[model samples]
Target: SVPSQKTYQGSYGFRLGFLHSGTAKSVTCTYSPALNKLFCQLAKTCPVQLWVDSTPPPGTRVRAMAIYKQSQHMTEVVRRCPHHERCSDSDGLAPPQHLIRVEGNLRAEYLDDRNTFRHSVVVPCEPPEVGSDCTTIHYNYMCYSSCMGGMNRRPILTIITLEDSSGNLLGRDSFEVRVCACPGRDRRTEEENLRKK
Candidate 1:
């Protein structure tokens, strides 16, 4: 991966939240993850846009969801781990183009209580060819219940603070994401689209 090339530092304000890394405190936080300023450390890896998705938002769904960036008020600075560090993105002279940091030695292990099951995904993108380095890391996870009864989605929203690491709130390095299933015909539900158009 390339070295750090971003101009700004601490782009996500301050890292000042609590971590649910274990112990009773961690589990307590699972139900009320704060978007405050702490987890801002590692969350700084998501791409930026007026609307959220793999691509830009369409006019039809302009207000479909409220895509928010938690670090908009913070600074931007790419940092290496205290022990080990890697190149930023591709070239050593260009900006990140999107995210704040791309971590190398990522570790994740989440145990859910209320949800029947949960899954985790961490996708890292190395920098382009030019300056040449690792690009960014994309992390995703979701908790689902055995039965999709009532008020589950709302409850799920309040639980667990999504992040890239345990020390998520120790630095200005987190990012925010907004989602709404898939877009266009792809996001259709079984009942909504019994048969495709």
Candidate 2:
């Protein structure tokens, strides 16, 4: 279900209606049992549909950006931290500064009935390589997963914002993207199926 625009409205003007994307037959979001998060796959172009809840003036621009929030050291610390123990020493680990690529028009169209503006954008799900610090797992198909410090998935936060012509903020919305080879697939069952062959 799409949230109300009031949930993400800025103090001043516009509000974010929703950010959605998917193919004709498949949805972009799926629950991953292993990562315990909503997941998407890498090496794919996500055609994003953004809706802003406002009849803007003339020069409102919509900008979208994606940030990868996982780090090798962060995953390492999580693996070492026991389920019951409090690991306070892992606080200062810095995430990698790599930014995902977003490409699309900044302009939006106003819908008469909905009274909202809509924009389309394409976001690439590729994450930067961790070099020698990570291991790459190739699937039977074209998909591959990069395991960083024993973690097979990475979380990315994609932020979409509406701004005025003067660069002032109007409204903002965000969503999470998990970059993995096989989203929603149970790895234990997959390995067991492979062993039976």
Candidate 3:
């Protein structure tokens, strides 16, 4: 019997970039010794800016989707609680959650005077407030507000995928975000100090 030879090969390429969406003077970023990762705080209300680049087959259009994923983590500290009278660490952990995939159409852009596909999308990280009152255990404000000693910070994995006109996979890329209500406190300063050996 004659053996069949394969001729098809995938050549799709993709890249992702991130930047602060607004004109903020500085973005808060901290290094975590425990996880060996750098985490950046999310803006109060504005969404982060995302840049995507892809190289698909010639004469084919591409579409993109952004998927956000995160796990449950601590949110607030008792010592820095906003409510002076009732300070406790009861409502300090946030449950794992994810956002709906954001879909967008990509356009052709010039790069080095060559034809390349590029697009920009805005992504928000913070979850919506849960309860109407602050006394409730599920209130998002207590967990996401810095004044409440909020430690509601967690790493988010954002995966971007490119699809061809016929909904076939083209390429994919991803980035990580460590969103925190108070970035200053999220830093591993204590760990760094203890490592003075």
Candidate 4:
């Protein structure tokens, strides 16, 4: 395919509430996947308009403008994953354009004695082996993302903790969520239909 040369990136704020407003300069276009529409003329315009289409457009040329997400607050990074990662599309696998879910079991062994009266963890992956210093956690993740030509990996890791009967804060076990696109419609869903007139 003959690649065109047009890419853009800028910082623009979106709203949190369903109905909210904000101001900005040097702003560009925005889109609403749920609404199936695109909003433009947003930088410095009195009236902005939205374009709608029945079929979604292909997102083959979009690029990520920032680094990978390092914390929970860094949510603007593009969603992509490597092949070795896990994806929970369950529907079926089709060259994922996003990160789905990392489904697996976590086995943790804690050496410290936090409670001095607590029991070890019980993991489902085994035959209910009980220990007083270890923990086993089973988890299922739910997420979505894509993996295209030029993409980055966003890794997630969380620790699980347990307490004893005295309700003491225990250290955390570890759980990591790792996993890992394309388009729609013709140039335009509707052509110049002269017959409709």
Candidate 5:
């Protein structure tokens, strides 16, 4: 008969470091308070190092410490929560840089195979932070502008690479946009004609 090894038990969660692609390996601990109770796992979803006093109920905020204090972790975690709560709380990069990376004017034109266009304008893209889940990025770019005859709107594709302050690429995305006037008859011209009349 083979001898059975005793099963170990205690509190366990993430320590620290960049949680990329999904999982990051580090130190997970076995903790026991003054009394024995329960356990919880930080299932690589939230990007913060955590140590809780006890099992915090779902959707409840608990007092947890940022166990591993990497340089970036300190600043980011502090910036997120100056103090810890009694229930499990979410704390990490307060603001996503992916949104910041894609700011301001990304301009392009509707050129023929000959690389010529009648009209061109600036294309504005919104920050991809509003509906983004902190774990992943979503970039939504839409451009609506007009051009002259013969030249159809040629789409301009650009790649936006999302990286951390450390310059590590967290995620990469591409979007195509064409700056051409709205489709259909000229409603603006009709309005102008009415005004002139």
Candidate 6:
């Protein structure tokens, strides 16, 4: 396992970083309590970095239950989480690049046209983070925004890459997302996860 960078900060739930086509090798996820921010960025690199955080339930399995830190508040961003297989292969370059190099048996089957590794990669994508229309509950993380008063109960989806499918060995083609409930109204659970672990 790769060592993640951790400093004296507040807390964190779980931080998972997705890989692109090429190996960056130095990217990391860090939570800033003073700033109330959890971010993922390429180490010492610019032109690529974004601000994002999970809402109420730290994270969710489906896309519709998580909130992203968009500008001011934790708005309803992901109405329904995206499926790895549902990603488009034709477009190799996109935002939140979730593409991961597949290996093992499935790689030879799903991705047989590549070198070193295999073919086909999956990405983690979310909807835009602003405006009224974009703030509706039909998005990936929809349940939170669906209820007018439920907006106060923010939720998040803490995700990690699985190494296999189904219950066989590691979830090679599967990604696991866990949801952790919190105490406050708009408080996120990650703040506690980071501090404890």
Point to the candidate with the largest TM-score.
Answer: 2
Query: What is the per-residue lDDT of model 2 for residues 1-197, given as tens digits with 9 covering 90 to 100?
Result: 12222235664343322223322234433432333233446434444444433345666566554433454422122121122123232212211111232323222222111322221222221232455322121111111224443223444444556667664567766655454554435333434565687
Ranked by TM-score, the better of candidates 4 and 5 is: 4
By lDDT, the best candidate is 2
lDDT tens readout by residue for model 1, 29-104? 1111333211211222222112111221121111000112223412212222222222243223212221222234
lDDT of 4: 0.25
The lDDT values for all models are 0.22, 0.36, 0.31, 0.25, 0.22, 0.25
Model 2 worst lDDT run, 10 consecutive residues: 135-144
User: What are the RMSD figures for all models against the true structure?
Assistant: 19.3, 16.2, 17.2, 22.9, 26.5, 17.9
Residue lDDT tens for model 5, 52-165: 233323222211111112223222211111121222332231122110111222331111112221111112222334554222221222222122221122223223322233
Tens digits of per-residue lDDT, candidate 6, 15-79, equal: 33232322123333333333233333211111112222422122222111122323343333333
Candidate 4 lDDT tens digits, 26-51: 22223233332222230111111111
Candidate 5 Cα outliers beyond 4 Å, as residue runs:
1-154, 183-197
Better of 2 and 4 by lDDT: 2
Candidate 6 positional error at 40, Å: 9.5
- Candidate 6: regions farther than 4 A off: 1-30, 33-153, 167-197
TM-score of 4: 0.22
- In Å, residue 147's CA in model 4 sits off its true spot by 9.6
TM-score of each: 0.22, 0.41, 0.33, 0.22, 0.20, 0.20
For lDDT, candidate 4 versus 5, the one ahead is 4
